[model samples]
Target: GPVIRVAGDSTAVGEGGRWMKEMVEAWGKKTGTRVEYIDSPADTNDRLALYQQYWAARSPDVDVYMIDVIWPGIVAPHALDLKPYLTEAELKEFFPRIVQNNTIRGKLTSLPFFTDAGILYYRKDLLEKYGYTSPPRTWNELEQMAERVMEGERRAGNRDFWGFVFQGKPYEGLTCDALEWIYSHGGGRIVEPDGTISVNNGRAALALNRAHGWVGRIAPQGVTSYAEEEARNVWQQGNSLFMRNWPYAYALGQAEGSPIRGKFGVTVLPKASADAPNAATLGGWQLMVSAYSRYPKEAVDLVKYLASYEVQKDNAVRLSRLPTRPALYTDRDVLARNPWFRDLLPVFQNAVSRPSDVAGARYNQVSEAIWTEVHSVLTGRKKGEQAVRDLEARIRRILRHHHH
Candidate 1:
């Protein structure tokens, strides 16, 4: 009997790990392998750091690791290659982008368990009452509508009402929000399709400036300190007219005690530049077996169980976690219960993953610094151009240190 040890964030612990536990128990009953979970803190950065410590020390106690999507490139060398363990048909069933995210060089290092993408959550009834038939399609239109809603709320004596709210804290949340603006306005942290790093120039600067400007005008002053939970809280409490968050908010927003239950609607994030298509940063985790694991076959089996269609569908309905399987998105029961899946399907299809390289730690570091400058610009501590210039210098230094 093999005991599997797992580690990761709240999404992993609450959603991914919970599903893993259920799948492992069922599989154990069928195959006679014993499974156990070693609880880890829900913070992603902390979880990554812990994994690093375990890997560096070559600890054999932890047999399996539930890795962040950004980790495949970094941890690939030390993680077991699951490709040899699974059939090609089983591998091909996963979302292409997800499989791409979990692959490093030419080897599949991890198996994607679930998927997530950013989407705009808005007040549907409010938009209709304000004569808007649909959510904004472009960044400019989004800003205009948000301003209009805020003005109306102001006239109605709602001083606390905000036009927009998003995860703006100086962490991963900030990077996620920053990426939307950067990508939407014809900008990117690292230019894709060619892998050229460009974040200091024309469109990127324009996008950064626009994001900072929006934060100054529409978002609450405290947004710079907010994470996902805080941002969703404001939106769910009816204090925000629009929110940029993951699908998990769907359940929370409509829960029985929610203040804005049944009043909000979900849509894809808007395009920052009319010429540029809308982009949502890819958000999800993957299951990987530690390289030092003794039971590689058993671990891979558990990974397969976690990714099975039945398990994915159950997790989607029970936890509001999106399934990585394309078929599940169109499943009649899934669509009927979680209608937002159909609306956000295209966004997920086109979502942009984080830079997939061993330089992920450097990427996070640079992203955090860039976001700090962004917050400074938004709060008037620094000019937007000055902040961009600073970010460019910092990013150049980081890239030189990591890639050079």
Candidate 2:
């Protein structure tokens, strides 16, 4: 019997760890593998740094690694390839994109644990009261509806209402929210299935400008300083007409003490332009066995158990984790417990994975730099066109120097 140790961010330690614990316990009762969960801090950068130190020292304490989706390109050289361990059936059970993203060259580095897609959170009662039959289908429509809601609130003497709240901070949150706008308007940071750079193109520029415009016109002041939790706090307090957030926000926003409790609704993110359909940036973590693991067999078994349909469904319903398995989407008991997921399945189905390559470290660095320019534009510190130009130059320099 070998003990499996898990390490990563909060989501990894939260839903992934919870599911892992259950699966390990059930498996232990049936078989004889021992598992221990080590809760780590929630910061992604900190976790990655810690893992690097542990691996550098060849520590075998953390048998299994729960890594961010982007880690394959950054850490794949040091990770144990899982393809030789997993059967064809087990490989097919996980989401294809998740598997593909984590596979460097021909080596499968990790198993998909959970998947996330950005969702539009709105007030159900507000929409109904305004005679809206359903959520806004396009960004323009959403903007118009939000403006109307704000006006109505103003006329009714409610001073706290706002149209929208988004992550405009100069961090990863800004990049995540910006991608929806960039992709929905027939635009993207980088072009296509090949990951060619395209930031200077007309469509990309327009998308960036429009995103800046929307946040400037509608989002609260000081939004450029707000991250995930800060933006979510305003929405959960019932101060905004709409919010763009991940699925976890739905459960938290509807919790007992939330001001908008029981009044929130979830749907796919709105399209920026009708020319392009709605898109959500795929956001979630994956599980991989450490290359330095002392108990590789035990780690593989634990990863397999966690990816099973039963464990995925249980976590989705109980802990509010969006299930990665497509089959669980229509499961009767799963849907019965997490009805919001049923309402949000369309978003998950259409979600897009972030631009990834074998050089994810460089990818992240360049994207972060561009997003900092975006924050400058959104905060009125720079013109949108100028900001785009600055980003173009920075990206060109990075790509030219780091071309692999």
Candidate 3:
């Protein structure tokens, strides 16, 4: 079998792992294209390192790459432009934000396989017990509710409980988490679409300071070092009143026999104030054909198929991964399997993206600068306003060094 090797994440456990195997094998059989699956590192940072090494050497061993949504600009030069392969109608079938995100400098670098956005998870049982009829719509409301539930649960015998948890680690995930805080507060994304630095404002600082106050007060001090899975583990065990995580946690938390199964609900993240709109950071993986691939035609074909409605719908049902296509959220089977998708559609539709497209090749540097300063504030090493100022300087230096 002269197979076209495809590199992708191997870390999806349970049904998602099964979906990967079944999807690839089914596609291979249908098209008579033998394929080789290359497992990449699960960690975002480590995976990028390996991908960069391959592209730097112009290796053709991997024909198709499953890349993060933020990597289109970073890998644009090394990936095949997919614009010619997709029709305008087909392009319109997916989320416009995702398509715009993938189209880097007129080159469509990748196709979104599935999309993700941050969400708030609350314990339904606890909320009802605490006399709350609805989830919080604002940050202040969440804080108050979380504290009440935590105090009540503790006095009732759960000594290990905390009010809330989230991704606080100084990594790319932190960039997403912190972006939600800043953006929901009406602070602009670190870099505006037109290349302006916007992280130096008072609203941005206030958002950070509010989050900083959560550490050890309502959230665990250890939360300062937590990532998605770390926060999930704490939440899945019923140790926290609320959590901020991606949609995947809904499936995991609702899985039969789990500690918090069937006792929780997922919703949009809270806004900074009652009048402020909620924000969820855009995230997900995309499929890109390697520019160095000898079988670019076959690779692109596979990418299109993977991103099709049939496959994405199946993925939504089986893996609980959100589909990039808006239509799937209301599909009968999809909604039947994952009822919360109905409530989550508006959140996904308005998800905020990082400064990847505008920052281009220097996106990582910009993200690093944002997360590092946010981490400092969360850890009490710096005040929010000072960190925001420092962050502005760091990003200004990054973008100015190479005027792209």
Q: Using lDDT as the measure, which candidate wins?
A: 3
Give the local distance difference test score of model 1.
0.76
lDDT for model 3: 0.88
How many clashes (backbone N, Cα, C below 3 Å) per candidate? 0, 0, 0
lDDT at position 282, candidate 3: 89
Q: By TM-score, is 1 or 3 better?
A: 3
Give the winner by TM-score.
Answer: 3
> Sorted on TM-score, highest at the top, how do the candidates line up?
3, 1, 2
Instruction: Locate the minimum summed-lDDT window of 10 residues in model 2.
Output: 8-17
lDDT of 2 by residue, 314-357 (tens): 76776677777778888998888788777767778678766556
> Model 2: how far is 223 from its true place, Å?
2.4
Worst 10 residues of 3 by lDDT: 9-18
TM-score of 2: 0.87
- In model 1, the clashing pairs are none
lDDT for 280 (candidate 2): 88
Model 2 misplacement above 4 A: 1-3, 11-36, 40-46, 154-159, 215-217, 339-346, 358-361, 401-404
Candidate 1's C-alpha runs over 4 A off are 11-33, 154-159, 358-362, 401-404
Put down candidate 1 lDDT per residue, 195-254, tens digits, no spaces.
456666677777767777777589887888878778877888888889998887887677
Error of 2 at 154 (Å): 4.8
Ranking by lDDT: 3, 1, 2
